């Protein structure tokens with residue numbers, strides 16, 4: 234039994250790991266590379282897509298699902314398991330990646346073909362392939378997200394997939410993994426623990442009252458798949474103490490996702506499920522308004538506050554948000570609220586550095602709006618959470634994360650008596 238990293242090696246995008254065992258070849262995730270590595274989606278997988286006996290998806294994020302169509306484009310015609318939630322989310326995530334994609338490395342024929350082989354596999358349901366036994370575990374990172382438990386040949390392997398931030402309220406807490414011979418885990422935040430959720434939420438409310446009371450705009454750059462709706466849930470459970478103001482979710486995609494959440498009630502925490510039982514949708518706070526097209530979206534730049542605006546991309550890589558920031562960052566009555574990690578050297582960090590001005594869409598725009606970073610809203614299991622999850626596991630291979638973040642986690646692991654290494658592209662590891 235060997236597990237061969239084929240992506241997310243000393244990096245965060247690309248997640249895809251080939252499991253060789255029981256005389257079968259099971260592919261764990263098949264995501265695309267993003268940002269600078271984006272051009273590697275045109276290169277070959279590094280293995281023979283036609284020799285895979287089945288593939289498993291831990292969640293719908295494009296970076297674990299993005300290359301699936303390519304896998305089908307190049308031959309594969311086997312099954313692709315995922316939780317029903319991932320199965321449905323996946324459709325929205327792929328269609329959008331197709332549409333909004335300059336250098337397409339796959340086409341509509343592939344998406345269709347790819348979605349055609351999806352089969353539901355829910356938490357605690359064992360798949361059988363040869364002498365192999367596989368099962369999903371509650372990962373708590375996205376609705377219907379899981380870590381993989383692969384067993385066979387008397388050995389046990391665990392692929393963490395992405396582990397969510399247990400402090401947040403929307404998804405359920407990650408399940409501990411079973412005792413295993415090898416754990417292939419992520420380490421997106423292996424260097425530090427997360428800022429407490431409760432205190433971030435409180436600070437968030439303060440920012441909203443001060444800004445909206447003064448007639449200002451709260452600009453919140455966010456991702457469309459889970460962060461957006463999570464902010465809405467917080468606006469729903471606290472909107473009772475917040476000044477009345479429209480909440481514009483300026484993301485069609487975030488819309489499509491939100492529309493789908495009621496079809497996924499079971500995929501959320503007890504808290505969230507209790508709200509749905511009362512017959513209420515806790516993801517639609519009073520005043521919510523999904524904006525569909527440009528014309529209305531641009532209107533928001535000229536309209537006065539108070540208002541709360543959610544728009545992508547979550548890392549300012551582009552998207553409707555740049556247009557809001559452009560016209561709003563100059564007014565001191567506004568507030569910018571980051572609810573996701575802003576990588577180094579990005580327009581995000583640049584603004585957080587509080588310079589006198591910033592360059593957005595071809596112009597130098599004074600930065601007078603207030604800036605705030607609500608780290609307690611960050612996505613992955615932070616370092617402390619990583620340590621607890623990994624606890625008691627003999628060997629650990631680290632993937633998904635910047636080299637330095639991975640090492641930091643390694644150090645602690647090493648010092649804990651745990652055998653650790655940093656996955657290398659193509660180099661398989663024995664279980």
Ligand SMILES: [Zn+2]
Pocket residue numbers: 292294374395
């Ligand atoms: Zn993810």
Ligand SMILES: [Zn+2]
Pocket residue numbers: 245248294296297395633
């Ligand atoms: Zn990921």
